[PDB]
Amino acid sequence: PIFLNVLEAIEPGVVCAGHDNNQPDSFAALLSSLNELGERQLVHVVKWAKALPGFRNLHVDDQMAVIQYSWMGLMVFAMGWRSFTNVNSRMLYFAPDLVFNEYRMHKSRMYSQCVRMRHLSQEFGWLQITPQEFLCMKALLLFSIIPVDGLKNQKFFDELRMNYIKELDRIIACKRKNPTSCSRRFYQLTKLLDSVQPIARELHQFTFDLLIKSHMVSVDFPEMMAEIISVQVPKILSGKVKPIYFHT
Ligand SMILES: C[C@]12CCC(=O)C[C@@H]1CC[C@@H]1[C@@H]2CC[C@]2(C)[C@@H](O)CC[C@@H]12
Ligand SMILES: Cc1cc2ccccc2[nH]1
Ligand SMILES: Cc1cc2ccccc2[nH]1
């Protein structure tokens, strides 16, 4: 399982948010911590992506593009997984020092979005998702959103996406027997993958509005976060860049 060896081998390690928990919760502090966590996580996601099989085939501008458009979903999907494995989806485990309970979900002023994310975490349990299926689905998420106008070199991207989908089928096919199970399983995983986009979309809208009024609510946005959310995210919210869905 060469391909699986790579995903397993390059999977990012634990990342902390640097949150002061001995300090009373507040909107400004929580969101500022989540943002810092984004900056820190982005760094790992970039190093992770550049190490994926065939990623370097993509044109350099397209490499940065898919990462800049997919980080939200990637991060949310991995966050859901940690929440499932660490606390069986009891809370949102953003980081070791940033675990969201119902109080924080509410205090973050993004309770509805958090509920959305916890529900995704629950799915990992309800579908009995394997660590390997998780890994393969996550890799596939990096290639699940592109500009309606296409990429610099769409042809390579298309080839790459086709291969990662082919790998997901392999994972499903192995350790299995019933051809009806393979198809059903693929149906469920693609359904799950699609369910990530609406959550990402809601978060994009939220962080965008947050960046705009950040100065008023006293929320901090690190360099890369401020740049990406003001330059790349708007392209998604305006319909110029959209998710690739399996199902209609
Ligand atoms: C991606 C992060 C940080 C990494 C993670 O574990 C998922 C989580 C989802 C909510 C995001 C947060 C980064 C900072 C954002 C974008 C805030 O501005 C509003 C929504 C937050
Ligand atoms: C490839 C790449 C993507 C990206 C996003 C934010 C900052 C730097 C980056 N390099
Ligand atoms: C996942 C993946 C398999 C593979 C084989 C050849 C070239 C690129 C590839 N990506």
Side-chain angles (χ1 to χ4, degrees):
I2 285 182
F3 178 75
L4 278 177
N5 289 334
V6 177
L7 298 196
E8 285 167 38
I10 66 174
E11 176 65 0
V14 184
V15 186
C16 282
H19 184 73
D20 179 358
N21 289 286
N22 273 71
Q23 191 75 296
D25 293 328
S26 76
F27 177 64
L30 293 178
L31 265 300
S32 290
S33 286
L34 280 169
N35 282 326
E36 172 55 42
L37 181 59
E39 186 86 337
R40 301 187 179 190
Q41 279 296 174
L42 194 57
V43 169
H44 284 82
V45 179
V46 168
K47 301 169 58 176
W48 168 74
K50 282 181 184 303
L52 283 169
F55 185 78
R56 257 63 184 304
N57 294 339
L58 301 174
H59 174 297
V60 295
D61 293 323
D62 291 327
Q63 285 184 42
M64 189 192 300
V66 286
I67 292 178
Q68 273 170 168
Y69 300 139
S70 75
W71 61 278
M72 189 64 85
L74 282 168
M75 294 189 194
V76 173
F77 191 71
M79 185 281 290
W81 179 253
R82 291 195 290 284
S83 287
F84 166 62
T85 74
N86 298 172
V87 290
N88 199 195
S89 309
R90 245 65 125 293
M91 296 167 276
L92 300 181
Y93 193 106
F94 292 107
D97 54 338
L98 194 54
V99 187
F100 268 42
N101 51 34
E102 293 278 300
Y103 185 72
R104 279 174 173 180
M105 282 178 217
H106 169 88
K107 181 104 289 187
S108 66
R109 301 183 196 181
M110 52 176 255
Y111 183 97
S112 57
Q113 294 84 172
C114 282
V115 175
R116 211 67 142 58
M117 293 185 282
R118 172 182 162 285
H119 185 271
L120 170 64
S121 180
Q122 291 178 287
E123 293 285 9
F124 287 114
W126 297 330
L127 295 174
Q128 296 196 185
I129 299 298
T130 66
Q132 272 47 58
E133 294 175 321
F134 160 68
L135 290 187
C136 194
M137 289 191 286
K138 187 161 63 60
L140 201 37
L141 276 180
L142 171 64
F143 314 106
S144 293
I145 178 175
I146 51 180
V148 189
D149 275 352
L151 293 167
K152 204 92 66 185
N153 297 167
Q154 253 286 294
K155 228 199 67 172
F156 292 122
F157 169 94
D158 291 322
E159 180 188 61
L160 202 40
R161 179 185 165 73
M162 183 192 306
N163 291 326
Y164 278 76
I165 293 171
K166 194 156 301 174
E167 291 299 329
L168 178 54
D169 308 314
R170 280 185 162 59
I171 295 183
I172 297 175
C174 295
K175 194 64 177 59
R176 194 175 302 296
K177 58 220 71 296
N178 307 301
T180 301
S181 181
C182 284
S183 291
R184 170 209 56 185
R185 190 55 173 183
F186 185 77
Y187 180 69
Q188 311 178 314
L189 302 198
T190 54
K191 272 294 177 187
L192 183 60
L193 282 171
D194 287 343
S195 74
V196 174
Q197 303 307 328
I199 302 175
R201 166 83 181 187
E202 285 175 58
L203 289 176
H204 284 143
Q205 291 172 304
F206 185 94
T207 193
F208 172 80
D209 296 326
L210 186 55
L211 171 67
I212 298 308
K213 69 181 193 299
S214 63
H215 61 294
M216 306 180 99
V217 293
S218 302
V219 171
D220 294 321
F221 279 83
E223 287 300 292
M224 293 184 285
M225 293 293 92
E227 185 184 60
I228 294 177
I229 301 174
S230 62
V231 184
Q232 311 301 330
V233 173
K235 293 180 200 170
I236 297 178
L237 303 176
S238 70
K240 290 160 74 168
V241 169
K242 55 211 298 182
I244 297 171
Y245 287 103
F246 277 98
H247 308 278
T248 312

